[PDB]
Swiss-Prot record, chains A, B:
Homodimer. The N-terminus is blocked. The covalent modification of cysteine by 15-deoxy-Delta12,14-prostaglandin-J2 is autocatalytic and reversible. It may occur as an alternative to other cysteine modifications, such as S-nitrosylation and S-palmitoylation. It is found in: Cytoplasm; Peroxisome. Changing residue 286 to Q: No effect on phosphatase activity; decreased epoxyde hydrolase activity. It catalyses: an epoxide + H2O = an ethanediol; (9S,10S)-10-hydroxy-9-(phosphooxy)octadecanoate + H2O = (9S,10S)-9,10-dihydroxyoctadecanoate + phosphate; 12-phosphooxy-(9Z)-octadecenoate + H2O = 12-hydroxy-(9Z)-octadecenoate + phosphate; 12-phosphooxy-(9E)-octadecenoate + H2O = 12-hydroxy-(9E)-octadecenoate + phosphate. Substrate binds at residue 382. Pfam families: Abhydrolase_1 (PF00561), Hydrolase (PF00702). The modification N6-acetyllysine is found at residues 42, 190, 214. This is Bifunctional epoxide hydrolase 2. Its main location: cytoplasm.
Amino acid sequence: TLRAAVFDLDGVLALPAVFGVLGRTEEALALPRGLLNDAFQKGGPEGATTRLMKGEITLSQWIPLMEENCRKCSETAKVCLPKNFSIKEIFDKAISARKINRPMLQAALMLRKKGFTTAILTNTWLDDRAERDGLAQLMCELKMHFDFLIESCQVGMVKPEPQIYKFLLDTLKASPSEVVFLDDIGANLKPARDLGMVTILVQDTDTALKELEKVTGIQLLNTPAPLPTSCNPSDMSHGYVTVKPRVRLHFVELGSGPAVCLCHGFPESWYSWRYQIPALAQAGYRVLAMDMKGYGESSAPPEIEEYCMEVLCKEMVTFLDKLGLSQAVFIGHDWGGMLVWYMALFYPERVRAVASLNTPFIPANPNMSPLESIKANPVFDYQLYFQEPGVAEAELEQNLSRTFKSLFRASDESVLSMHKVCEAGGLFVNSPEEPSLSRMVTEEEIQFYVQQFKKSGFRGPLNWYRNMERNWKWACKSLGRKILIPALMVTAEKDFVLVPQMSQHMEDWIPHLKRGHIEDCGHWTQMDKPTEVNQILIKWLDSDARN
Amino acid sequence: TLRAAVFDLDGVLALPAVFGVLGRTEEALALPRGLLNDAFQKGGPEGATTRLMKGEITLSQWIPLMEENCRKCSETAKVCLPKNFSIKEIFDKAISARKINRPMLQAALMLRKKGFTTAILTNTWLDDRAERDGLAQLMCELKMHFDFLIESCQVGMVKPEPQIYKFLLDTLKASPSEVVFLDDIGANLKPARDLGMVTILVQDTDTALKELEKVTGIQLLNTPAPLPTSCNPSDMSHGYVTVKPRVRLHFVELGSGPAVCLCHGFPESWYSWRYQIPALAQAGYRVLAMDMKGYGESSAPPEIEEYCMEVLCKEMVTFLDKLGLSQAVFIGHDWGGMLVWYMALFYPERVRAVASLNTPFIPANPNMSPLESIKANPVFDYQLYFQEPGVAEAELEQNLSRTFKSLFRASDESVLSMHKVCEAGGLFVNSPEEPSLSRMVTEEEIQFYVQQFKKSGFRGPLNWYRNMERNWKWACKSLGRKILIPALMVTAEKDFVLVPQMSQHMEDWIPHLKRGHIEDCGHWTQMDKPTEVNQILIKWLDSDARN
Ligand SMILES: O=C(O)CCCCCCNC(=O)NC1CCCCC1
Ligand SMILES: O=C(O)CCCCCCNC(=O)NC1CCCCC1
Ligand SMILES: [Mg+2]
Ligand SMILES: [Mg+2]
């Protein structure tokens, strides 16, 4: 019958419980047991700590007051304090040491995923310390995961007072009988129990989760490895930069730090990075997930030349120019991958670091024309099929839903065959009309791509495949160069078009090139293995792009 | 007859001329005169330097080659090199030492302001050094100031070759007879002169400008102190964050670094920061110039409560949340100023630093109601006039152009009288129908505000003045607090509504408060004194908000 889960912060979703430091500072400084705890609660309701918890005074105003309480509390047990005693020192250390109890957050997230209304009910303070940013960031991450965040210092209500509970019940629009309350402080449980709501005294996460699991009848403990945070398109910050007359690029922006520009491939969207955007951001980066020219909310001019690599790159440079960015780490996938490689080859000054997924850097053959080269590779047949304007457009557009359900599939789900399409007459010639639902995408997500492409269609996207002669000539100018800025190539085992083997000779043009490999990963890397990707990129950014 | 100005980079818009370092490294290292210069041009057209200048090889590939040339050039004059000789060492130092020759840039900008088509024609290289970002940033700033930037390493054409010149003439769509070419290298002047175009051998900036001034017949030297860079609305990056259902805030974003959120007052726009956005960005900040709720492209819901300070602040917090920002320096003006003060009082954790222009922080009088307080101040009469919904809306909306031309005026231009409006019956009762053109705003700019307000009107904006009772109560909760995070108050002498005197007791609630004062500055601070403002804020950010 439960339908709401409320989690305590310090001691439930965050550990080590700040305040739980008092006890340690005593056993450490060999002070009388509880001394610092009695000072922390000196005065009870009228106490400085309760005022601080209600929002009457800021943390910085409180610190001095708690110090006074550590002078009057010790004044009574004979006892004196160390020459270097500092409440700020003790708390700054305590707060930053406190981290998100991941297992609890996971339980929280799960419950939310199955219908529950989650909320954080905590006794906190207005933090104006010079290190406040620490708490801020931790709050930034947690917040987005709960429907509600009830902070005492914000409502002026602190709990064991039953009023904050009524407030909670009201904020939740739920009755006691259907609410679970997790807290590491017994007292704060009494008022909850009294209104008639399930309470869990949280000591060790696992036991609490055990009790929570039982009471909710939902698998929380020993649950499979969850998917990284995906982002809701409507909650994202959307940006629009006009890089040329009637050519504006749309992008999603999240987080702060070095600018990391993500460039999706064909036929995708900024949405194809729905998994790494929150991660890279959380990792300390300003993620700029693009809508490459031709897709979604970005301009999709009809002309082919508008999509030759040179014009595409210049625009990206202008994009940086307009945004007031001198550099950006360029991370591309598929056609996007190709784009970033040339960004590093023609605009190193603007690329802090470059990284590609699946797409390897392969210099142009000054002798053989692209068309010929590609004709010499069975798996690259479809590219010839995309040459004739209109042809590919018609089929890929006939049924958008079908197209994406047919494309976005894991290694072991294929329903197509990129080899022999010119012969078959089309990409879906012998593909089901109603393709099954891939394990990588939800019906909702596919529908996002469908709605995106309902704007500009596949002309713009397909044109990226119609400038090989031009790209070839352009690239030939870079044959004497070498990518010497930080570069990271990430191969996908199960990608049968952009095979890992195609990248083997890359160290020749990119000497310091770093690598990454993902097993059982198909072409749609980001979707297929978001966890490993985020892992691989975050590790690479922190080492070769942050400095 | 001239109509185009082309400036050389190294040695014309940038100094000290990199390469001009060779000569110094010789006299410094007591090397044979010219030794390093002969190595830098070892091979002429076929030389490593010419390949580097054409884009064939990157700078990092060149460095090794120039070193070889410093071994073979010294191999001939008997001579050997120091144990610690490094071409990278010499160049990294040279490039970063090179700075924008401001006087030249000013001449460039002026000419552009008077009809000329300006362009930078330079022999440069693809910079992939680990310090490349240096050049990048300098290029980022210059670029935006010229219609064209012709880089040799990008066109594969380097100059004294006459071809790059034809390219130039073509890029300019202008004939030789109407082009001026500034360069510190005689040789590069010959090809220009030969096509029949005015050339200026630039040695010392002033003499060159003297010659340029003469040949163009335009005052370039000893010109008045120019206005800071203003930004073109259509070239700005526009962002939209939905903070609540059917409530999305629009903002302009530029630059990278600590996030600095700018909050305009009544009745303005993000455009009111058109002067500090490029500056603060150039200063190393990520400027987020807002469109405060109720204005421009931001949502303007009809209800009054939607604009009480509490709701306004919560939304700003959500704005940060959505953008993945844990903190932001909040700089507000007028009503915006008020907003940031309360952001620091209720969300210190999110405010890296707070700064207000004109608007002082004055705690709520727990006894007297706002309405009464304001009735006790003649100059605050209009605020009572803004109370009745519809009233103020009708007048301010009757003639938008008139309204803004009537409002946006410097201290010595007033055409109104904020004292006695309830009596007069309106704000413009005895104001000209066709107000003159203020020295602060161009007809075009006023028209921007006019077009902005044609969307939501003055209801939303006016509502900011209709929640005093609510704001009062809210603020009373903060009476026991103190702004202890970095704060900077900036007063305006000639502001007769938000007078400097109203801020005198601010140190009481903001102990570490820093200040700034601008003379002969009216209420519309940003417009009135952009130079001093940018100066004051940049100085404050670099000291109290960067760390
Ligand atoms: O090989 C070459 O010489 C040039 C290659 C340019 C390659 C772009 C490669 N990416 C795709 O083709 N993705 C397809 C994967 C399958 C579904 C459609 C998009
Ligand atoms: O004084 C108080 O008690 C509360 C004050 C809230 C004040 C907002 C002040 N800013 C303006 O009024 N600007 C007007 C300047 C003149 C043109 C119209 C906007
Ligand atoms: Mg607790
Ligand atoms: Mg020169």
